[PDB]
Amino acid sequence: LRAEQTRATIIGAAADLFDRRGYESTTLSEIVAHAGVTKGALYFHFAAKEDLAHAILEIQSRTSRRLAKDLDGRGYSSLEALMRLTFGMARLCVQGPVLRAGLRLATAGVPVRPLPHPFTEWREIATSRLLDAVRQSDVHQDIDVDSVAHTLVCSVVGTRVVREPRRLAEMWYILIRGMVPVTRRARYVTLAARLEQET
Template sequence: MARQLRAEQTRATIITAAADLFDRHGYESTSLSDIVEHARVTKGALYFHFAAKEDLAHAIMEIQSRTLRRLANDLDSRGYSSLEALMRITFGITRLSVEGPILRAGLRLATGGVRVRPPLAHPFAEWRDIATSKLRGAVRESDVHPDVDAQAVAHSLVSAFVGAAVVGHSLDPLARQPRRTAELWRIMIRGLVPVPRRARYVGLAARLEREITTA
C-alpha cells in the first residue's frame, strides 16, 4: 500500500513538473531530461510511468478534461441558473489556471498541435458542448435573448476565452487572468442578456473575479 502511494505521488510530481515546463517553454522545447531534472526524479521513475513525452501530454489533457467535467457536474448540483453555472465554469477554469500549471499546460498543448488521442475529446469541443447546453438552458430561463444561436455563441465564447488566455500568456501577468475573464463576460452579457437581467450578471462577474483575486 505504501509503495502504491509513493508511486502515485511520483506520477503526480512528474505530471506537475511536465505541465510547468510545457506551460513556460512549450511542448516541443521541453525534453524528457528537462522533466526529470525539474521533477527531481530518476529517468527510471519517469519511464516507469510514461513511455514517451506524448504520454505525459495526454495525461495532462486527461486531467484537464476530468477537471472540467467535475467542475460542471458540481455546479449542476447546486441549483444555479444555466447562465450563472456557465459563468462559474469559466471562472473556475481561470482560478485553477492561476493556482497551478496543469490547466495552463493543457490549454497550451491543445493550441500547440499536440494530438488528442481517442477516446478523449478535444478540450475545445468539450468546452463548446458544455457552453452550448448551458446557453440553451439560459434561453429557456429567459436570461438570454430568445433569438440567440446557442451553438454559435458557445463557439465564440470558447474562442474568446481561449484567445484571451493565449494572448495573456504573452502579455499579462498570471494574476490578471481573472480580470480578463470578467471583461469578457461584461461584453458577452451586454450582447446576450435582456436589459432587466443584466445588472445581476454584471455584478456576478465582478464578484467571481474578486473571489479569485482575494483568495
C-alpha cells in the first residue's frame, strides 16, 4: 500500500510521453523508466497500454464535466458560463499534461471505451449553453447554434489538432461581434478581455 501512490506518477509519465511523442511509439518500458518505478508497479494499476489511455480520457472527461457543472451553478448568464469554461479548460491544459495527452489521444483516434468521445461531449455542452443564451437574448434567435458549437469546439481545441488566453479571446471577439445583439455586446467583449488578462 505504497504502490497506490505511484499511480498518479505513472499517469503523469504516460501523459507526458503521449503528449510529446504520441501514443503509438511510447512503450510501457519508456513510461516505467520515466516514472522511476518497476514494471510491477505499473501492472498493479494498468494491465496494458490501452488502460493508461483510458485512464487519461477518464480524467479529461470528469474534469470537463466538473468545470461545466460548477460554472453553471454560479449565477452567471449561460453565455458567460460557456466563455469561462473555455478559458477555464485552457488554464488547466497549460497547467497539466493529462489533458494535453487526452487531446492527443483523441486526435490520433485511440478508441474511447463504451465513455463518449470528448469532442462530442464538448459539442453537446457548447450546444446546450448556446441554446440557453439564445433564450436569454444574449445570442440572436436566427443563429444556428449547432454549427457554432462545432466551430467552437474545433477552434478552442487549438491549431495542434489541425499565448492561449490571447488566441481564445480573439475567437470570442469574433463570435461576440457576429452573434450577440449590439446592446448586449460590450459586456461580453469586456468579459473576454478580462478572462485573457486573468489567465
